[PDB]
Amino acid sequence: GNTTSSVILTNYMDTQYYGEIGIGTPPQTFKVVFDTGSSNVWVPSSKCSRLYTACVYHKLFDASDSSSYKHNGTELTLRYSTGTVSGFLSQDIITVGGITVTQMFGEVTEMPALPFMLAEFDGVVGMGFIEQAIGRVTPIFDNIISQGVLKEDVFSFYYNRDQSLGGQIVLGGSDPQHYEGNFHYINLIKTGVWQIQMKGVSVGSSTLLCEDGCLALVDTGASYISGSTSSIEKLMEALGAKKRLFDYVVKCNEGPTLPDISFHLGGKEYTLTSADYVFQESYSSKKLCTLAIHAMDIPPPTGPTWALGATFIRKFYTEFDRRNNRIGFALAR
Numbered sequence: 001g002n003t004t005s006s007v008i009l010t011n012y013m014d015t016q017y018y019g020e021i022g023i024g025t026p027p028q029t030f031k032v033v034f035d036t037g038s039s040n041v042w043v044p045s046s047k048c049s050r051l052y053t054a055c056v057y058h059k060l061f062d063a064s065d066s067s068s069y070k071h072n073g074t075e076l077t078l079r080y081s082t083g084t085v086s087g088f089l090s091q092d093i094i095t096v097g098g099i100t101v102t103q104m105f106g107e108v109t110e111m112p113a114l115p116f117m118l119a120e121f122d123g124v125v126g127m128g129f130i131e132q133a134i135g136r137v138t139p140i141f142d143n144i145i146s147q148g149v150l151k152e153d154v155f156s157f158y159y160n161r162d163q164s165l166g167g168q169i170v171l172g173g174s175d176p177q178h179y180e181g182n183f184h185y186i187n188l189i190k191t192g193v194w195q196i197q198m199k200g201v202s203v204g205s206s207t208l209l210c211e212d213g214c215l216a217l218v219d220t221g222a223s224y225i226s227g228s229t230s231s232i233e234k235l236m237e238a239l240g241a242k243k244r245l246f247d248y249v250v251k252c253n254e255g256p257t258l259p260d261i262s263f264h265l266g267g268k269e270y271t272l273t274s275a276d277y278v279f280q281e282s283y284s285s286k287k288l289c290t291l292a293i294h295a296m297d298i299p300p301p302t303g304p305t306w307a308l309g310a311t312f313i314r315k316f317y318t319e320f321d322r323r324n325n326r327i328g329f330a331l332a333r
């Protein structure tokens with residue numbers, strides 16, 4: 001119990017954060033989202049048809065090039081908020097920074113253009129619990145915990161804004177170069193999902209939303225802070241933001257006039273300024289600027305729930321603690 005492993009992350013557009021893993025012997029490299037909202041590992045397969053355009057423009061795992069590959073073949077479908085993939089289970093050695101682990105993962109053969117033609121990453125490394133794993137496949141972090149190499153049973157996420165480091169995941173600890181001060185932690189409501197109680201969402205000093213408490217999924221594979229359609233409607237109305245065709249917008253010049261939004265988590269107020277939630281692509285009075293807050297109706301049993309995604313994580317460096325089933329936050333830098 002003396003190792004940490006860091007993976008540097010690419011930040012694409014403040015909406016996708018991904019880093020690399022190896023799969024096989026020798027390692028084949030894939031860009032992957034490290035996603036606390038799910039618990040399966042998958043990458044696209046060389047058995048993916050090239051009529052799926054996503055399988056032309058992403059890297060494919062070729063199992064016949066790996067001496068450590070072991071066949072399974074059980075088919076599985078993974079249904080995300082933004083899209084669905086299906087494929088078959090395989091087993092091989094996965095390299096994550098300085099760590100290797102024998103892992104069962106999906107070889108995805110069905111990869112629809114929506115959303116995977118807008119995914120700059122190849123696949124997904126689920127950082128959630130086995131309870132949310134499709135097929136009850138042991139998640140990669142649980143298998144890494146079994147090795148007893150990690151200094152602590154935690155992992156941490158730094159997501160940068162906007163060259164610079166796009167971000168960083170640390171397995172086994174945290175990186176104090178990327179946060180100020182000390183963590184305050186919020187306990188999970190229950191084991192099996194990275195979800196915590198939230199005791200209020202305030203706009204300025206007035207708690208408009210989640211007044212009787214609500215749920216917050218801390219979701220490293222989500223781009224935005226999200227709430228239900230109803231919640232976000234009220235939030236946007238409070239801000240003066242309007243729904244342009246697909247998204248909520250403000251006049252770019254008016255972004256700096258917008259009030260702070262605070263999330264009441266574990267007896268602390270986690271406050272984002274308008275600079276933290278308005279995509280200020282301009283400050284022009286002649287242009288419209290979108291917000292990094294979207295409606296997302298997450299179905300039961302996980303939802304209805306808020307999701308604290310990359311927008312939140314940018315502001316607050318986040319440690320996911322499996323030893324204690326809690327989530328730590330500190331101010332990112």
Ligand SMILES: c1coc(CNc2ncnc3sc4c(c23)CCCC4)c1
Binds near residue numbers: 018033035038115223
């Ligand atoms: C990191 C932070 O935000 C993101 C945003 N994530 C995505 N963006 C666009 N398409 C997809 S498909 C898919 C995901 C995703 C997340 C992982 C499960 C499956 C990554």
Ligand SMILES: *[C@@H]1O[C@H](CO)[C@@H](O)[C@H](O)[C@H]1NC(C)=O
Binds near residue numbers: 089
């Ligand atoms: C594939 O893995 C699953 C565990 O999720 C197991 O039930 C099944 O027996 C495995 N198949 C083979 C051929 O080992």
